Design an enzyme around this catalytic site. Structure first.
Site, PDB file in Angstrom:
ATOM      1  N   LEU A 130       0.863  -1.177   0.000  1.00 57.86           N
ATOM      2  CA  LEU A 130       0.000   0.000   0.000  1.00 57.86           C
ATOM      3  C   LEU A 130       0.906   1.235   0.000  1.00 57.86           C
ATOM      4  O   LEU A 130       2.006   1.198   0.545  1.00 57.86           O
ATOM      5  CB  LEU A 130      -0.906  -0.025   1.243  1.00 57.86           C
TER       6      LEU A 130
ATOM      7  N   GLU B 162      -9.054   0.812   8.693  1.00 58.32           N
ATOM      8  CA  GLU B 162      -9.542   0.676   7.325  1.00 58.32           C
ATOM      9  C   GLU B 162      -9.594  -0.808   6.948  1.00 58.32           C
ATOM     10  O   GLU B 162     -10.486  -1.225   6.193  1.00 58.32           O
ATOM     11  CB  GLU B 162      -8.635   1.444   6.350  1.00 58.32           C
TER      12      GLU B 162
HETATM   13  N1  NDP Z   1      -5.383   0.442  -2.437  1.00 60.26           N
HETATM   14  C1  NDP Z   1      -6.082  -0.707  -2.461  1.00 60.26           C
HETATM   15  O1  NDP Z   1      -7.217  -0.943  -2.075  1.00 60.26           O
HETATM   16  C2  NDP Z   1      -5.431  -1.994  -3.058  1.00 60.26           C
HETATM   17  C3  NDP Z   1      -4.131  -1.912  -3.562  1.00 60.26           C
HETATM   18  N2  NDP Z   1      -3.567  -3.182  -4.126  1.00 60.26           N
HETATM   19  C4  NDP Z   1      -2.144  -3.109  -4.711  1.00 60.26           C
HETATM   20  O2  NDP Z   1      -2.159  -3.077  -6.177  1.00 60.26           O
HETATM   21  C5  NDP Z   1      -0.731  -3.378  -6.586  1.00 60.26           C
HETATM   22  C6  NDP Z   1      -0.809  -4.544  -7.553  1.00 60.26           C
HETATM   23  O3  NDP Z   1      -1.453  -4.144  -8.525  1.00 60.26           O
HETATM   24  P1  NDP Z   1      -1.780  -5.063  -9.831  1.00 60.26           P
HETATM   25  O4  NDP Z   1      -0.470  -5.179 -10.523  1.00 60.26           O
HETATM   26  O5  NDP Z   1      -2.797  -4.558 -10.678  1.00 60.26           O
HETATM   27  O6  NDP Z   1      -2.264  -6.419  -9.200  1.00 60.26           O
HETATM   28  P2  NDP Z   1      -2.986  -7.734  -9.501  1.00 60.26           P
HETATM   29  O7  NDP Z   1      -3.082  -8.521  -8.240  1.00 60.26           O
HETATM   30  O8  NDP Z   1      -4.180  -7.536 -10.324  1.00 60.26           O
HETATM   31  O9  NDP Z   1      -1.745  -8.531 -10.398  1.00 60.26           O
HETATM   32  C7  NDP Z   1      -1.953  -8.791 -11.882  1.00 60.26           C
HETATM   33  C8  NDP Z   1      -1.634 -10.277 -12.075  1.00 60.26           C
HETATM   34  O10 NDP Z   1      -2.626 -10.961 -11.694  1.00 60.26           O
HETATM   35  C9  NDP Z   1      -3.278 -11.841 -12.682  1.00 60.26           C
HETATM   36  N3  NDP Z   1      -4.491 -11.383 -13.364  1.00 60.26           N
HETATM   37  C10 NDP Z   1      -5.130 -10.145 -13.255  1.00 60.26           C
HETATM   38  N4  NDP Z   1      -6.215 -10.044 -14.009  1.00 60.26           N
HETATM   39  C11 NDP Z   1      -6.215 -11.333 -14.630  1.00 60.26           C
HETATM   40  C12 NDP Z   1      -7.169 -12.044 -15.659  1.00 60.26           C
HETATM   41  N5  NDP Z   1      -8.226 -11.316 -16.100  1.00 60.26           N
HETATM   42  N6  NDP Z   1      -6.886 -13.368 -16.074  1.00 60.26           N
HETATM   43  C13 NDP Z   1      -5.788 -13.959 -15.534  1.00 60.26           C
HETATM   44  N7  NDP Z   1      -4.908 -13.455 -14.652  1.00 60.26           N
HETATM   45  C14 NDP Z   1      -5.193 -12.112 -14.234  1.00 60.26           C
HETATM   46  C15 NDP Z   1      -2.041 -12.071 -13.523  1.00 60.26           C
HETATM   47  O11 NDP Z   1      -1.196 -13.053 -13.034  1.00 60.26           O
HETATM   48  P3  NDP Z   1       0.279 -13.757 -13.544  1.00 60.26           P
HETATM   49  O12 NDP Z   1       1.142 -12.652 -13.924  1.00 60.26           O
HETATM   50  O13 NDP Z   1       0.585 -14.739 -12.534  1.00 60.26           O
HETATM   51  O14 NDP Z   1      -0.411 -14.393 -14.767  1.00 60.26           O
HETATM   52  C16 NDP Z   1      -1.469 -10.628 -13.627  1.00 60.26           C
HETATM   53  O15 NDP Z   1      -0.016 -10.368 -13.782  1.00 60.26           O
HETATM   54  C17 NDP Z   1       0.066  -3.603  -5.241  1.00 60.26           C
HETATM   55  O16 NDP Z   1       0.753  -2.496  -4.597  1.00 60.26           O
HETATM   56  C18 NDP Z   1      -1.129  -4.044  -4.340  1.00 60.26           C
HETATM   57  O17 NDP Z   1      -0.911  -3.971  -2.948  1.00 60.26           O
HETATM   58  C19 NDP Z   1      -4.245  -4.425  -4.183  1.00 60.26           C
HETATM   59  C20 NDP Z   1      -5.503  -4.561  -3.708  1.00 60.26           C
HETATM   60  C21 NDP Z   1      -6.272  -3.376  -3.090  1.00 60.26           C
HETATM   61  C1  DH3 Z   2      -1.283  -6.169   0.084  1.00 64.80           C
HETATM   62  O1  DH3 Z   2      -2.186  -4.871   0.553  1.00 64.80           O
HETATM   63  C2  DH3 Z   2      -3.410  -5.262   1.106  1.00 64.80           C
HETATM   64  C3  DH3 Z   2      -4.629  -5.133   0.342  1.00 64.80           C
HETATM   65  C4  DH3 Z   2      -5.910  -5.514   0.869  1.00 64.80           C
HETATM   66  C5  DH3 Z   2      -7.145  -5.323  -0.057  1.00 64.80           C
HETATM   67  C6  DH3 Z   2      -8.046  -4.070   0.362  1.00 64.80           C
HETATM   68  C7  DH3 Z   2      -7.953  -3.093   1.428  1.00 64.80           C
HETATM   69  N1  DH3 Z   2      -8.887  -2.090   1.574  1.00 64.80           N
HETATM   70  C8  DH3 Z   2      -9.952  -1.973   0.709  1.00 64.80           C
HETATM   71  N2  DH3 Z   2     -10.903  -0.962   0.854  1.00 64.80           N
HETATM   72  N3  DH3 Z   2     -10.086  -2.872  -0.327  1.00 64.80           N
HETATM   73  C9  DH3 Z   2      -9.189  -3.901  -0.530  1.00 64.80           C
HETATM   74  N4  DH3 Z   2      -9.429  -4.771  -1.630  1.00 64.80           N
HETATM   75  C10 DH3 Z   2      -5.994  -6.042   2.215  1.00 64.80           C
HETATM   76  C11 DH3 Z   2      -4.775  -6.178   2.997  1.00 64.80           C
HETATM   77  C12 DH3 Z   2      -4.883  -6.719   4.372  1.00 64.80           C
HETATM   78  C13 DH3 Z   2      -5.226  -6.967   5.480  1.00 64.80           C
HETATM   79  C14 DH3 Z   2      -5.672  -7.373   6.576  1.00 64.80           C
HETATM   80  C15 DH3 Z   2      -6.691  -7.900   7.162  1.00 64.80           C
HETATM   81  C16 DH3 Z   2      -7.596  -8.855   6.540  1.00 64.80           C
HETATM   82  C17 DH3 Z   2      -8.789  -9.740   6.591  1.00 64.80           C
HETATM   83  O2  DH3 Z   2      -9.782  -9.469   5.937  1.00 64.80           O
HETATM   84  O3  DH3 Z   2      -8.780 -10.739   7.294  1.00 64.80           O
HETATM   85  C18 DH3 Z   2      -3.481  -5.789   2.459  1.00 64.80           C
HETATM   86  O4  DH3 Z   2      -2.324  -5.940   3.265  1.00 64.80           O
HETATM   87  C19 DH3 Z   2      -1.498  -4.846   3.899  1.00 64.80           C
END
Ligand code: NDP
Ligand code: DH3
Length: 186
Positions: A22, A30
Site C-alpha cells: 500500500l 480501514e
Molecule cells: N489500495 C487498495 O485498495 C489496493 C491496492 N492493491 C495493490 O495493487 C498493486 C498490484 O497491482 P496489480 O499489478 O494490478 O495487481 P494484480 O493482483 O491484479 O496482479 C496482476 C496479475 O494478476 C493476474 N491477473 C489479473 N487479471 C487477470 C485475468 N483477467 N486473467 C488472468 N490473470 C489475471 C495475472 O497473473 P500472472 O502474472 O501470474 O499471470 C497478472 O499479472 C500492489 O501495490 C497491491 O498492494 C491491491 C488490492 C487493493
Molecule cells: C497487500 O495490501 C493489502 C490489500 C488488501 C485489499 C483491500 C484493502 N482495503 C480496501 N478498501 N479494499 C481492498 N481490496 C488487504 C490487505 C490486508 C489486510 C488485513 C486484514 C484482513 C482480513 O480481511 O482478514 C493488504 O495488506 C497490507
C-alpha cells in the site's frame, strides 16, 4: 452471487499500491472495514467469495493468507496450481465468474467481492450485470505505482446511503477517509 461488488481504498490521486504494498502506512481501522464487508455474508451457512489478481495475493502478508472465513480465488495465467492456501485458481475473470455461478457453488456462496488488482477492477467494471463499487476515499495524496479506473457518474450512481455503511468522515494516524458506495444496475 450474480452482482459484482468491487472493494478498494484509493488516495485523492486515485493511488493504489506502491512497490508491492500500500502507498500509505498501515491503516488498521480501514482493514477492519474491508474485513467486515467482504467477510459478512447475508446468510448463515454461506461464505462470501473474494476474487483477486496474483500480485495482490502475494502482497498480502503470509500470516493473513488466505483471507479467513472467505472463499479465496486467485487469477493467474502462469501458475498451474492454486498457490498454497488459495481455494481456487482461474485463468481469466470470465472463468471465475462462470465457476461461481455453478450449482455446486451457488449453494455455499453468497456475496462476490473483487478485492485486488487494477486490471481485475477494470475488467470487472467493463461488463454487463449488476455492479457495486465500495470505495474508501483516502483524503490525501500518496506516491503510487498503480491506480483505480475512473468512475463514470453517468453510468454509476452515488448511493446516498447503504445498509451497514457509515458515511461520517473517519481518521487514523492523522489520515482522514470515508466510505462511499456506487451502483450500476443493468
Ligand atoms: N489500495 C487498495 O485498495 C489496493 C491496492 N492493491 C495493490 O495493487 C498493486 C498490484 O497491482 P496489480 O499489478 O494490478 O495487481 P494484480 O493482483 O491484479 O496482479 C496482476 C496479475 O494478476 C493476474 N491477473 C489479473 N487479471 C487477470 C485475468 N483477467 N486473467 C488472468 N490473470 C489475471 C495475472 O497473473 P500472472 O502474472 O501470474 O499471470 C497478472 O499479472 C500492489 O501495490 C497491491 O498492494 C491491491 C488490492 C487493493
Ligand atoms: C497487500 O495490501 C493489502 C490489500 C488488501 C485489499 C483491500 C484493502 N482495503 C480496501 N478498501 N479494499 C481492498 N481490496 C488487504 C490487505 C490486508 C489486510 C488485513 C486484514 C484482513 C482480513 O480481511 O482478514 C493488504 O495488506 C497490507
Amino acid at each position: 452471487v450474480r452482482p459484482l461488488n468491487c472493494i478498494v481504498a484509493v488516495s485523492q490521486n486515485m493511488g493504489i499500491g506502491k512497490n508491492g504494498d500500500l502507498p500509505w502506512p498501515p491503516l488498521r481501522n480501514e482493514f477492519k472495514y474491508f474485513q467486515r464487508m467482504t467477510t459478512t455474508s447475508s446468510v448463515e451457512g454461506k461464505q462470501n467469495l473474494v476474487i483477486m489478481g496474483r500480485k495482490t495475493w502475494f502482497s498480502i502478508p503470509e500470516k493473513n493468507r488466505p483471507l479467513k472465513d472467505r472463499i479465496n480465488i486467485v487469477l493467474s495465467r502462469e501458475l498451474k496450481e492454486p498457490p498454497r492456501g488459495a481455494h481456487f485458481l482461474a485463468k481469466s475473470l470470465d472463468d471465475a465468474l462462470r465457476l461461481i455461478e455453478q450449482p455446486e457453488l451457488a449453494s455455499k456462496v453468497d456475496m462476490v467481492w473483487i478485492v485486488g488488482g487494477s486490471s481485475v477492477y477494470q475488467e470487472a467494471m467493463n461488463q454487463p450485470g449488476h455492479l457495486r463499487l465500495f470505495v474508501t476515499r483516502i483524503m490525501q495524496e500518496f506516491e503510487s505505482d498503480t491506480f483505480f479506473p475512473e468512475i463514470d457518474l453517468g453510468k454509476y450512481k452515488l448511493l446516498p446511503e447503504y445498509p451497514g455503511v457509515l458515511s461520517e468522515v473517519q481518521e487514523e494516524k492523522g489520515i482522514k477517509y470515508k466510505f462511499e458506495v456506487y451502483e450500476k444496475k443493468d
